[PDB]
Curated annotation (Swiss-Prot):
It catalyses: L-seryl-[protein] + ATP = O-phospho-L-seryl-[protein] + ADP + H(+); L-threonyl-[protein] + ATP = O-phospho-L-threonyl-[protein] + ADP + H(+); L-seryl-[tau protein] + ATP = O-phospho-L-seryl-[tau protein] + ADP + H(+); L-threonyl-[tau protein] + ATP = O-phospho-L-threonyl-[tau protein] + ADP + H(+). One of its GO terms (molecular function) is ATP binding. ATP binds at I7, G8, S9, G10, S11, F12, G13, D14, I15, K30. Belongs to the protein kinase superfamily. CK1 Ser/Thr protein kinase family. Casein kinase I subfamily. Changing K30M: Impaired kinase activity and abnormal subcellular localization with exclusive accumulation to the nucleus. This is Casein kinase I isoform delta. Monomer. Component of the circadian core oscillator, which includes the CRY proteins, CLOCK, or NPAS2, ARTNL/BMAL1 or ARTNL2/BMAL2, CSNK1D and/or CSNK1E, TIMELESS and the PER proteins. Interacts with DNMT1 and MAP1A. Interacts directly with PER1 and PER2 which may lead to their degradation. Interacts with MAPT/TAU. Interacts with SNAPIN. Interacts with DBNDD2. Interacts with AKAP9/AKAP450; this interaction promotes centrosomal subcellular location. Binds to tubulins in mitotic cells upon DNA damage. Interacts with GJA1. The gene is CSNK1D. It comes from Homo sapiens. The lineage of its organism: Eukaryota, Metazoa, Chordata, Craniata, Vertebrata. The chain holds residues 9 to 294 of 415 of the full protein. May be involved in Alzheimer disease by phosphorylating MAPT/TAU.
Amino acid sequence: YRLGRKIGSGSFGDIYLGTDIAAGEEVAIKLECVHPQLHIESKIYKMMQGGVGIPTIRWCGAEGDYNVMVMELLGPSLEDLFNFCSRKFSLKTVLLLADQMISRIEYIHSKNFIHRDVKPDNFLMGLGKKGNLVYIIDFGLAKKYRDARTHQHIPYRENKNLTGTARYASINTHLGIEQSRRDDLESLGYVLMYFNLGSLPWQGLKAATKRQKYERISEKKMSTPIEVLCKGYPSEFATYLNFCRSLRFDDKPDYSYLRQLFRNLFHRQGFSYDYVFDWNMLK
Ligand SMILES: COc1cnc(COc2ccc(F)c(F)c2)cc1-c1cc2c([nH]1)CCNC2=O
């Protein structure tokens, strides 16, 4: 593997572009200085392997002063594509995205884990034949939510300090409640509305401590009724967020219902099933 330039930073470590030298294929290479977390993330990926929209790990090991995890190269993140599309996606694109994202999250849940860091940066489009598939990345904050053998849900816990990115965190996460399935989905809800509006009402709030800033975000989040947040947009978005906040800590979300909400809306809007995203029209 030839090592390349730094293209990003995950919940842990830094990712670089690279090359499978003998196959002449470009790859993504995540490095962790040899508190270790890379191997754990690698195990989760392997456990998720074989699912739709999940990256393939090509190699895992240590070289020098680094633990290394080579992954198949993917396309731009949804945050990147959002930028390229002038930071506003058309309703059809949000719906096409929502259908796949609910599904990715549902799959991770079917495998007994919660992601805990659902945000535009952690969703990347594929390449080649899978150019229209939305992948989910970075399991650096993922956690098991039910025992593999018995499916006993983890217990309810309070006073937890925040983990994930504040902009898309659920109201309960801000309130120190252990995250569960409902939270990955509520976060997706804010992500969708972010795509619709171009920004969220609790963005760009200035504070001192960089811990007092989460407080402002929390208060704003609890001070902004859902109907206001989604005012001027299809009621489905508000219905989706309300459903998410109504989920009991250990409830199994009805993913099908949520997708159907957006599918019916798609049908009613009269959009064509050609799967053409906004970025597919850049010339
Ligand atoms: C399977 O994981 C990946 C596969 N392919 C790419 C290609 O990314 C680029 C290609 C060309 C560019 F010019 C560029 F800027 C980025 C990136 C990743 C990736 C993994 C992680 C991140 N990114 C940021 C957050 N934490 C992560 O664990």
